[PDB]
Amino acid sequence: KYVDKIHIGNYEIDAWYFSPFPEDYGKQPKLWLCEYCLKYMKYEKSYRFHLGQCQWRQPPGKEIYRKSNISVYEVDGKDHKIYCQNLCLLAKLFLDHKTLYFDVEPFVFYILTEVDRQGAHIVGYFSKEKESPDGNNVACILTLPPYQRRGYGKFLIAFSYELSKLESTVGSPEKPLSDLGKLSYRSYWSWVLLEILRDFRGTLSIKDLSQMTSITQNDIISTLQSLNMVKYWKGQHVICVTPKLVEEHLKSAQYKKPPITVDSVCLKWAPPK
Amino acid sequence: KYVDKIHIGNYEIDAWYFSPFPEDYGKQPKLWLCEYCLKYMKYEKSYRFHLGQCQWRQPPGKEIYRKSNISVYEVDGKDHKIYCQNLCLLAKLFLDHKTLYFDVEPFVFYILTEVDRQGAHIVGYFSKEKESPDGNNVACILTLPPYQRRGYGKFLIAFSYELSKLESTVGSPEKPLSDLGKLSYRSYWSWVLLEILRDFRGTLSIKDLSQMTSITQNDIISTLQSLNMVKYWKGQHVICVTPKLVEEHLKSAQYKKPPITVDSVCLKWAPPK
Amino acid sequence: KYVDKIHIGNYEIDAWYFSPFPEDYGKQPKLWLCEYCLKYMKYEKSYRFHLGQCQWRQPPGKEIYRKSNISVYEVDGKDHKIYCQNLCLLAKLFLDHKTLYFDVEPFVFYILTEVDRQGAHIVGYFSKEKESPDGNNVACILTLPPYQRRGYGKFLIAFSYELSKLESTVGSPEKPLSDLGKLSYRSYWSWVLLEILRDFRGTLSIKDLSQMTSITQNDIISTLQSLNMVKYWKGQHVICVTPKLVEEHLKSAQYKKPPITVDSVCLKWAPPK
Amino acid sequence: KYVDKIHIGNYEIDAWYFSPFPEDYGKQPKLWLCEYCLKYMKYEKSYRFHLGQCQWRQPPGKEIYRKSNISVYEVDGKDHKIYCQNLCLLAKLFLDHKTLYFDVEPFVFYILTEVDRQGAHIVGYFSKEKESPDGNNVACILTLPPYQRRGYGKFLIAFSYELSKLESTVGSPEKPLSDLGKLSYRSYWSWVLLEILRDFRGTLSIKDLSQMTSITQNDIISTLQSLNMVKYWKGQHVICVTPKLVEEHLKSAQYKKPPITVDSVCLKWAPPK
Amino acid sequence: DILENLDDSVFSKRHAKLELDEKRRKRWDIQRIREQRILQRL
Amino acid sequence: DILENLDDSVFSKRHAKLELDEKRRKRWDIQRIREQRILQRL
Amino acid sequence: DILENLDDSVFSKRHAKLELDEKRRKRWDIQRIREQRILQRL
Amino acid sequence: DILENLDDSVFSKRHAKLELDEKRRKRWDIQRIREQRILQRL
Ligand SMILES: CC(=O)SCCNC(=O)CCNC(=O)[C@H](O)C(C)(C)COP(=O)(O)OP(=O)(O)OC[C@H]1O[C@@H](n2cnc3c(N)ncnc32)[C@H](O)[C@@H]1OP(=O)(O)O
Ligand SMILES: CC(=O)SCCNC(=O)CCNC(=O)[C@H](O)C(C)(C)COP(=O)(O)OP(=O)(O)OC[C@H]1O[C@@H](n2cnc3c(N)ncnc32)[C@H](O)[C@@H]1OP(=O)(O)O
Ligand SMILES: CC(=O)SCCNC(=O)CCNC(=O)[C@H](O)C(C)(C)COP(=O)(O)OP(=O)(O)OC[C@H]1O[C@@H](n2cnc3c(N)ncnc32)[C@H](O)[C@@H]1OP(=O)(O)O
Ligand SMILES: CC(=O)SCCNC(=O)CCNC(=O)[C@H](O)C(C)(C)COP(=O)(O)OP(=O)(O)OC[C@H]1O[C@@H](n2cnc3c(N)ncnc32)[C@H](O)[C@@H]1OP(=O)(O)O
Ligand SMILES: [Zn+2]
Ligand SMILES: [Zn+2]
Ligand SMILES: [Zn+2]
Ligand SMILES: [Zn+2]
Structure with a gap:
């Protein structure tokens, strides 16, 4: 591990694992990341400059879910390659077994955001292969550390299955x-x-x-x-x-109603093809 | 599945899986097995004849454990090949993933028996590779169906670890x-x-x-x-x-004291080499 | 063998081997080929029409050798893909071990022609991989059957080495x-x-x-x-x-001066890079 | 190359290639070999001692050919392992591509000898796999350097085919x-x-x-x-x-009658099985 | 019997998928040869 | 210390060769898995 | 119906060739696993 | 310098383990060739 800390939005987040940020960006102890477009930087000067320059306040896709302050965006890796690659590099910091970072065209990304006056702030995501040989409705799944243990992880899983339901298909997360x-x-x-x-x-x-x-x-x-x-x-x-x-089992700790649930009516998504 | 029932001792036991009993013995619906030497037969006539002919009342090895009516025998696959091969064919009837039946020389077998006036009657066993590349202190483990859910399975596991302890070694059952x-x-x-x-x-x-x-x-x-x-x-x-x-967890169903336990003092075994 | 005869220019040439002409063109007993651009056709009607339509009287490359009525053209597979693919399909009819027909971009083709008032008429060729891992200065080499046993084959070989000389490199034809x-x-x-x-x-x-x-x-x-x-x-x-x-050996049949020889002065070629 | 010279019988023969003589025998510059049983030695003292101790005056097999002073012996690698292994080590000194030396049981060896009052002195040999998947009537073939260019090599080849003829089979030497x-x-x-x-x-x-x-x-x-x-x-x-x-071609140097020829009548051999 | 379209684009269309077939087979053989070389030489 | 160029094209340039690296490794694994499946199942 | 020969030698004879079958399959798998480990780890 | 033991048993002892080495290498190559033949011919 060389980069062990990142600054994204107003969060200082400690990195869990190695991530292969290219060239000399992989060797820096700390990296600055835009919370909207997810671009990575060596120095703070370029970060404070980018805030008043960046042209995004949301992930670069369709808003396919909206209830309360929760919005989910669908980003196609083919249309917004750079964004998804940056996301994948960010994601690897918290995933031990993530293999893909740059071959993002075959993937579609579903970004979980909390929305306020400023914009749509990234909470977590899951990736999904468009054409999966093993029928994987999720490839990698992540809730960023500051947002963890609020129920958002169980929302993303529940969300991945709602997509599968609307596709008349069965699905399983990538193992292991x-x-x-x-x-x-x-x-x-x-x-x-x-x-x-x-x-x-x-x-x-x-x-x-x-x-x-x-x-x-x-x-x-x-x-x-x-x-x-x-x-x-x-x-x-x-x-x-x-x-x-x-x-x-309904009274046991083996049953627990998710704090945040996918509301079917609030989903505004059409399945492909 | 061709052979779906066996007669061993006074038990009629329904077979769980396929077992590759050689030649036309694999095609018979029922097989007769000697409870002492474990030889298999097509017809009942040869079984009733064998009872008053067989020269064994125990497995062909050292009695390495004795407490009450429980005895455990150590059988080396190199010294008693035929016996262990027959055991392995018997064993396959209740094991889905057993691979070896005839290459028994590299294996040592520990037979669990209940002893009375007649002899030492087979209850179950576990097999163990003498030289295991993965450190497997158990290869296959089995309690014959009529003896199941009495605690004998947990005895055999406990027994396999007692051997490992006396060998100053760590061990794990063969996966999966x-x-x-x-x-x-x-x-x-x-x-x-x-x-x-x-x-x-x-x-x-x-x-x-x-x-x-x-x-x-x-x-x-x-x-x-x-x-x-x-x-x-x-x-x-x-x-x-x-x-x-x-x-x-001591009060939960996740804690349960084994009905039958290995008593260290009653073990009469020396570790090899 | 399905296509066993071709018509090219005014020649009727019997095919030596199979060639994988695409779709239903591979199943026709005879094919018509333009002698200049080498396009293949099912029916004669389209051939007699093409003669007064085709816009080529030479192979689509640089004339890199000219002496008497002999001219050699350098055709790059990347620039004139269609032409080289057609050439490769034609070529396979007389080569048992030709493997490539459509992946022509990595190859450069040297076409041997006899020139008159009408144009530059194809006699034979050799293909060459731009970047050869085994140092092959020739991949396939061919003199069309009607032009065989005149010395043109030994000219093409001699030509391939002249290129190698001007590249300060050693070379060998692809085996076998x-x-x-x-x-x-x-x-x-x-x-x-x-x-x-x-x-x-x-x-x-x-x-x-x-x-x-x-x-x-x-x-x-x-x-x-x-x-x-x-x-x-x-x-x-x-x-x-x-x-x-x-x-x-100078007086034996093991020595024979080639009827047609590459004249170095008449070569007008620059080596790449 | 470590051992570059051998003494066998009264011959000093320079080694052509490496041979994997076991242990410290492979590191000696010179080795002494018995001309009858082919055992190898480090020191001369043990050689001069062995001459008046050795109990062989022929190769350890059937004499299957005798004409004049030429005799050929058939040695089965299974019956006389040590002899054939020693032969194979000797043989490797003059064969670049010999692979087998110790696995001699699947092989049968045909030893060419010149016979006088003293015994049958080894001139050369060829080896042959009993069961060849590729139909090889010869595996390795050798005329020891002092006996070379007398015609003995062409005798051994001619001999290998005579065996094949009597086996109603076609055959070819091992390639390359x-x-x-x-x-x-x-x-x-x-x-x-x-x-x-x-x-x-x-x-x-x-x-x-x-x-x-x-x-x-x-x-x-x-x-x-x-x-x-x-x-x-x-x-x-x-x-x-x-x-x-x-x-x-009968008058050319491409035709030459072998100086020594296999005489069919002088062959006293029965084909196996 | 029938007149044939001899435009470049016609040939480009019926060769494109065959061009891709060969490229894939070439990648296969490169890997196969590299794997063979590693396994035998140890 | 120094101001950084955060244009898309900058990222596209330092990711392009890494994108190709992964694609090649993915072709390798697909072939490797297919070869393993053929060899064990006979 | 018929009386069966239950001597050791009978079992030794009908197991011998099956014992050899398994030994060969075990050599196959050892080599197959070793080859797989070499190819993936480079 | 020293007298050497030329009994058969001496040779049998220093050849036995080398005989086993070759047998194992021969099993390796048979499997390797069979695997190569299966993979290329499909
Ligand atoms: C398909 C794949 O990619 S597998 C990779 C899975 N993801 C990762 O490992 C990346 C890093 N980890 C994460 O992002 C998160 O831990 C996730 C995605 C697994 C879950 O995110 P969260 O939003 O925190 O999950 P959520 O709040 O819905 O809680 C889910 C369950 O995990 C439990 N949990 C989460 N974190 C912890 C923790 N540190 N310790 C104990 N339990 C925990 C919760 O108690 C809850 O279980 P419960 O219903 O029994 O209470
Ligand atoms: C390493 C290997 O070879 S893995 C193969 C394991 N063995 C097999 O699959 C062969 C067939 N099965 C068997 O022989 C047996 O089921 C064994 C060996 C797994 C256990 O034998 P037993 O003597 O019946 O086990 P024992 O009486 O010690 O009970 C062990 C546990 O299994 C549970 N169990 C056993 N059978 C059952 C059943 N049919 N349903 C539910 N639970 C069961 C018991 O409740 C007990 O758990 P607990 O302590 O929570 O109560
Ligand atoms: C690298 C590769 O691709 S290998 C593939 C080689 N090419 C082929 O097989 C395709 C079909 N064959 C051909 O195109 C031709 O036969 C070629 C290219 C080999 C030679 O073409 P030609 O122009 O006829 O050769 P050329 O007239 O220079 O004669 C060369 C030699 O081949 C001999 N030769 C050519 N054809 C024949 C024949 N049918 N019978 C006997 N000898 C022949 C000639 O006698 C001459 O030898 P010589 O110098 O001892 O007299
Ligand atoms: C199947 C295999 O194992 S392939 C391995 C072949 N053997 C070897 O390489 C081992 C070392 N070499 C030898 O033992 C010998 O050279 C052998 C076996 C090839 C031939 O042994 P010889 O008894 O010398 O062969 P012989 O006297 O019958 O002559 C055969 C031909 O080889 C030629 N020849 C032999 N040695 C030489 C030499 N040094 N230079 C030129 N020509 C030679 C002869 O002129 C003769 O050809 P010809 O009929 O045109 O005159
Ligand atoms: Zn930004
Ligand atoms: Zn019995
Ligand atoms: Zn044309
Ligand atoms: Zn001797």
């Missing part, structure tokens, strides 16, 4: 997940399944749950395993959901 | 684990760690726990994660054990 | 050579070496010959072997040239 | 051939084909020649090419043998 990634997804999956298993008056196969939620059969099964809703007969695992098991 | 394998190990690991974290009056690093138990640092970490004893700072995970977290 | 390719090169190499070994008043190492001719040390050695000018001591082969061996 | 190997085979092949093409009153296809001689169609074709008995039509090569071409 980090420890905080596992906790976030498992928490989200439990909440979704428990809400369905509480209300649904009918027979449910694992297949149905997948179609209802866009969660994969694999992710559903392992979620049900951790909720003690799977029994084992001759090696093979079969679903066993009871009103008692649902009731108990 | 089956769903019942995961449950068994996680249950064992939790119990071991909780017993230590309850009693030890001193500073413990993950390194120490590994040396005390022969459990790998990886298996220790993930165990502690599930016991909520790991916090997260800048991505990296650090140990956080409190008397409250220990107390709470 | 066809039977007619071997005969042509061996014939050329013998003549060059014999002319030098007859006239040179001094000591010559294999290294010098290479620098004088741009022929590789390998090709020189094997040429000398066939001229009986190599003796063998403890496995290793050493040069042994005598006035007797030179004299004898 | 050394320069002296090429000269020897080409010389042999020419002589065989010219003798047939002179005498045979009938139609001969390349197929027939192969069956008559056990020479491969490939080796036949290239031999005919060098004898100018191949014409070329549309790339493909067709046989063209005339009484003039046969007559001319």
